Amino acid sequence: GYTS
Amino acid sequence: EATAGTVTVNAITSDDTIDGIELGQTISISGKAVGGDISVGDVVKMTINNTEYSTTVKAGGIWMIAGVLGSDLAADSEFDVVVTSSDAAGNKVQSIGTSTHSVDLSAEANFSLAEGQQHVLTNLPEGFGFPDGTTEVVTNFGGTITLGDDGEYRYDAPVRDHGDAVSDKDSVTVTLEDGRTFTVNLDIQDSAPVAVDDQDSIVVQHEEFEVSEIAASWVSYTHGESVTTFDGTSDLGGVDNDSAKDQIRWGNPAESKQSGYGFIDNDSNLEGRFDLNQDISVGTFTHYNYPVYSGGAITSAEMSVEFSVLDVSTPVTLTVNFDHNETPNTNDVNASRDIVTVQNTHVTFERDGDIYTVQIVGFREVGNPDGEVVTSIYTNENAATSYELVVRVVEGDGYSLPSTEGNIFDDNGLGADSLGADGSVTVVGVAVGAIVSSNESVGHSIEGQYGNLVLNSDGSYVYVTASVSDIPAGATESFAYLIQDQDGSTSSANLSINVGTN
Ligand SMILES: [Ca+2]
Ligand SMILES: [Ca+2]
Ligand SMILES: [Ca+2]
Ligand SMILES: [Ca+2]
Ligand SMILES: [Ca+2]
Ligand SMILES: [Ca+2]
Ligand SMILES: [Ca+2]
Ligand SMILES: [Ca+2]
Ligand SMILES: [Ca+2]
Ligand SMILES: [Ca+2]
Ligand SMILES: [Ca+2]
Ligand SMILES: [Ca+2]
Ligand SMILES: [Ca+2]
Ligand SMILES: [Ca+2]
Ligand SMILES: [Ca+2]
Ligand SMILES: [Ca+2]
Ligand SMILES: [Ca+2]
C-alpha cells in the first residue's frame, strides 16, 4: 502492498 | 681377662667427608680411648690405605695422628683403630673402634649466562682445571668451555628455545686423574629483541582553485510515477541563485505530498574557491520522505554538479548517482525508513596541463564538519533529513591518497631494531597511541589521528585521510608496535610520522  | 675399653674416632674433618681440596692436604685424625684397662701411654694403631699409623693414648683418653695424607683417606673410607692395654696382673687386651667417612671429590661451579654469547667464567672453584692436554670440553647442550692462551675459561652459550618443555640449564663435568671432578652448571638466560623508535614523514600538498558558482541539475531517473524536476521554490526545496533544476519529486501521495530530493548549493559559503586535499561541501542534500502509494517511487536519480575552474574557464561536470529505496511501510518505524545511497563517482579536469580529480566522499551531518561521512542515509516516513554533500579534490587521477612506506626494522633515524639471539622476529601487535600488546591488527588497516596504517608482520608499512584544514603545524602520528622473537620475548617501539602541509 500500500504505502512506501 | 683384661678389660677392654671404648675406642672412638672423631669425624674425619668437620663434615666427616674428604673433598677435593682436602685430597691434597695432610689431615689430622683424632679420637678417644677410655675405660676398662686402657691407660695413658697405651699403643694406638690403625691401617689406612695400607699404611700403618701409630700413636699413644694421652691424658683424658685422647689420641691423635698428626698427619694422614688426604689421598690415603680418599682411597680408604673405613678403618679400625686398635688400642693395646694391660691390667695390673699383665693380662693384655685389644680395644677396637671403627671409623667410616665419606669421600666426595666433586665441586660445582654455577653460572647464569646470556644465550648466544661467549663468556669468561669467573670465580671458578679452587683447583679448577682441565686434564693435561685438554683445552676444550663440550657441554650437554653442545656448547664449549675453552681454555684460552690467556689462561681464562670461556663458555660459548648456545641459543635456546626458552618457551618449550626442555630445561635450558647446561652442564658439563670435568674429571681429573686424581679423582677430582668439577661440575659446571650453566643456566642459559633468554635474550630478547630491542625495538627502536622509527621516524617517517609525509607532506600533503595545498592548492587553491578559483571556481565559478555551482549549478546542480537532476538530469535523469529510473522508475517512479508523476516524476518532476524543477528549480526550487519557497514551498518546495527552498530557493537558490540559479535556474538549474535542483529539486526532484515522485510518487502518488498517500497522505499529503510527494517524496523526493532537493539540493541547495553552497555557492555563498564557498566564495568561488575549492582547496586540494580538503573535504568540501558542495551543497545541502535534503531527502523528503513522504508516504506514497507503493510502486510509484524512483530507484535511482542522477544529478549533474556543474562549475567552472579558472585557469580561461574549463567547465567541469561531476555526475552524482543516487540509489533510492522507498521502502514498503509497516508498523516498524525504523524498517519503514527510506534509504538513499550515493555512489562514489568522480570527474577529472585539467588546469594548466596539471590534472586533478573531484571525488564524491559522501553525506555529512549539517553543521558537523568533523562528523562522520556516510554513503547511505535513512529517513523516517513523514520527515526530511539534510546532509552536506562532501567532495574532495585530489591531485592526478584520484587513485590514491597521500602515502608513505617504510619498514620498522630499518634504521629510521635512531638505529635498526636489534633482533636478539633467538631471531624469528616478527611484528605481533600494532596500535595507535603509546600502548601495544600482541593483537589482531598486524596486516590490517588501523586508524590513526590523521590517516590509516597497515603494518605487516615483516615490519613493512604503508601510511593520510585527514583534510588539510585538520592538520595543525607540527602534527604527528604515533603508532606503537610490538615485536616478538622465537620463544616469546617482546619489545615495543613507536613509529612517529610527521604530517606536514605544503
Ligand atoms: Ca671435609
Ligand atoms: Ca689442591
Ligand atoms: Ca692398663
Ligand atoms: Ca680400610
Ligand atoms: Ca665418621
Ligand atoms: Ca628450553
Ligand atoms: Ca656433560
Ligand atoms: Ca632464547
Ligand atoms: Ca548556484
Ligand atoms: Ca511531481
Ligand atoms: Ca533558483
Ligand atoms: Ca536551482
Ligand atoms: Ca516514503
Ligand atoms: Ca518507506
Ligand atoms: Ca617513508
Ligand atoms: Ca624500529
Ligand atoms: Ca627470547
Q: What does B142-183 look like in DSSP terms, one character per residue?
A: S-EEEE-TTS-EEEEPPP--TTSSS--EEEEEEE-TTS-EEE
- Among the bound ligands, the one closest to the CA of B174: 7
d(CA B47, CA B26): 16
Which three-class secondary structure string do you get for B375-416?
CEEEECCCEEEEEEEEEEEEECCCCCCCCCEEECCCCCCCCC
CA B352 distance to own-chain centroid: 49
Long-range contacts of B410-413 (CB under 8 A, 24+ apart): B410/B198, B410/B459, B412/B197, B412/B198, B412/B199, B412/B200, B412/B495, B413/B197, B413/B198, B413/B199
d(CA B378, CA B376): 7
Of B457, B464, B479, B462, nearest to B409 by C-alpha is B457
Q: Which H/E stretch holds residue B79?
A: strand B78-86
- Among the bound ligands, the one closest to the CA of B230: 12
* Distance from the alpha carbon of residue B70 to the mean position of ligand 16, in angstroms: 62
The burial class, CB within 10 Å (0-12 / 13-18 / 19+), for B177 is: exposed
CA atoms within 13 A of residue B127's CA, in its CB half-sphere: 20
Residue located via cell numbers 519503514? B336
Q: Which residues contact B13 (CB under 8 A, 6 or more apart)?
A: B22, B27, B101
Among chain A residues, CA nearest to B324: A4
* Distance from the alpha carbon of residue B161 to the mean position of ligand 12, in angstroms: 73
Residue B151 in contact with partner chain A when CB distance is under 8 A: no
Of B178, B176, B189, B191, nearest to B137 by C-alpha is B176
Among chain B residues, CA nearest to A4: B328
Exposed e or buried b per residue across B202-239, where buried means at least 16 C-beta atoms within 10 angstroms of its C-beta: bebeebebebebbbbbbbebeebeebebbebeeebbee
Cβ(B479)–Cβ(B430) below 8 Å: yes
d(CA B401, CA B124): 64
Residue B331 in contact with partner chain A when CB distance is under 8 A: no
- What's the start-to-end Cα distance of chain B, in Å? 122
- DSSP symbol at B468: G
B-proximal residues of A, 1-4, CB under 8 Å: 2-4
C-alpha cell at B359: 571525488
SS3 for B71?
Answer: helix
Q: Which residues of B touch A2 (CB under 8 A)?
A: 254, 293-294, 329
Cβ(B105)–Cβ(B181) below 8 Å: yes
* Distance from the alpha carbon of residue B139 to the mean position of ligand 16, in angstroms: 36
Residue B156 is assigned to a ligand binding site: no
Cβ(B94)–Cβ(B82) below 8 Å: yes
d(CA B364, CA B375): 9
- Among the bound ligands, the one closest to the CA of B495: 16
Q: Which residues contact B165 (CB under 8 A, 6 or more apart)?
A: none
Residue B294 in contact with partner chain A when CB distance is under 8 A: yes
Q: Which residues contact B57 (CB under 8 A, 6 or more apart)?
A: B33, B38, B39, B40, B41, B42, B44, B63, B83
Distance from CA of B336 to the nearest CA of A (A): 7
Residue B22 is assigned to a ligand binding site: yes
Q: Phi/psi at B351 (nearest 5 deg)?
A: -130, 115
d(CA B486, CA B424): 5
Distance from CA of B345 to the nearest CA of A (A): 28
Please indicate whether, in this complex, the C-beta atoms of A3 and B254 are within 8 angstroms of each other: yes
Please indicate whether, in this complex, the C-beta atoms of A3 and B291 are within 8 angstroms of each other: yes
Cβ(B251)–Cβ(B290) below 8 Å: yes
Among chain A residues, CA nearest to B325: A4
Q: Which residues contact B36 (CB under 8 A, 6 or more apart)?
A: B2, B3, B4, B5, B6, B85, B93, B95
Of B283, B286, B240, nearest to B260 by C-alpha is B286
Residue B335 in contact with partner chain A when CB distance is under 8 A: no
CA R_g for chain B: 48
Residue B258 is assigned to a ligand binding site: yes
Residue B370 to residues B289, B374, B388: CA-CA distances in angstroms?
Answer: 26, 12, 12
Q: Return residues with CB closer than 5 A to ligand 16 (ion).
A: B 196, 198, 408, 417
Note the resolution in Å, 1 decimal: 1.6
Beta-bridge mates of residue B362 = B390
Using alpha carbons only, give the angle B407, B409, B414 rounded to the nearest 5 degrees.
100
Phi-psi label, residue B151: left if phi above 0, alpha if psi -120 to 50, beta otherwise = left
Of B460, B444, B469, B464, nearest to B401 by C-alpha is B464
- DSSP symbol at B231: -
Distance from CA of B249 to the nearest CA of A (A): 14
d(CA B156, CA B145): 7
